[PDB]
Amino acid sequence: NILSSHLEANSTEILDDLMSGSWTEPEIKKFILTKINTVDHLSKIFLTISKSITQNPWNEENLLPLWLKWLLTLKSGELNSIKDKHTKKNCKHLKSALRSSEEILPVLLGIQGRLEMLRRQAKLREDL
């Protein structure tokens, strides 16, 4: 349906950002896997999603990161072999954009502990 519209648009020649938008429109998990299973080659979906997740490594939408993790689950026998000239610095800047969350997961878990302590002692001292 709309997954087929996004498939045809992303397969023809153009409209890759609008293609990921149309993929984010219906946005099924099963159809998300099916759109990776159907196509036989990509027009540097890894490159455009690399620049999107590089420019927003902190977005509340799970759509493009879900698409990236299923692309890397199902097609990484070929993403390491499609291209290795711009794709090398692509994975480099993606890996350096994403390592900071591994750097700051402990402070966020610490602040989560802080806030749970504060809210639970405030629920405790509730003035009878």
Binding site: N37, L72, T73, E102, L105, P106, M117, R120, Q121, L124
Partner: protein, 94 residues
């Protein structure tokens, strides 16, 4: 699992006594060392469950592409009535 429910309640309720104590880390060192060694390896098992779950759902979706096929694939047989028509001494007999 069960006992750290006790340790979070001791900090919440007695939040004044052990902030007025002068050496918190020196007085409950064993808690600090236990939690440091429990939470120090968190990136390692993050990488472990990423790498594990990736292969797990990889074979799960590849086997869910054909999960109905192995329910009636086994059509195996055995030494059927060709063995009875085969036993030529038992064909002279019966």
């Amino acid at each position: 699992g069960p006992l750290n429910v006790w340790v979070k309640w001791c900090l919440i309720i007695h939040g004044g006594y052990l902030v007025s104590i002068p050496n918190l880390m020196s007085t409950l060192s064993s808690l600090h060392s236990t939690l440091k060694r429990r939470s120090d390896l968190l990136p390692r098992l993050l990488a472990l469950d990423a790498r594990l779950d990736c292969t797990i759902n990889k074979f799960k979706t590849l086997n869910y592409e054909a999960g109905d096929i192995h329910s009636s694939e086994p059509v195996v047989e055995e030494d059927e009535d060709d063995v009875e028509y085969n036993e030529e001494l038992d064909d002279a007999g019966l």
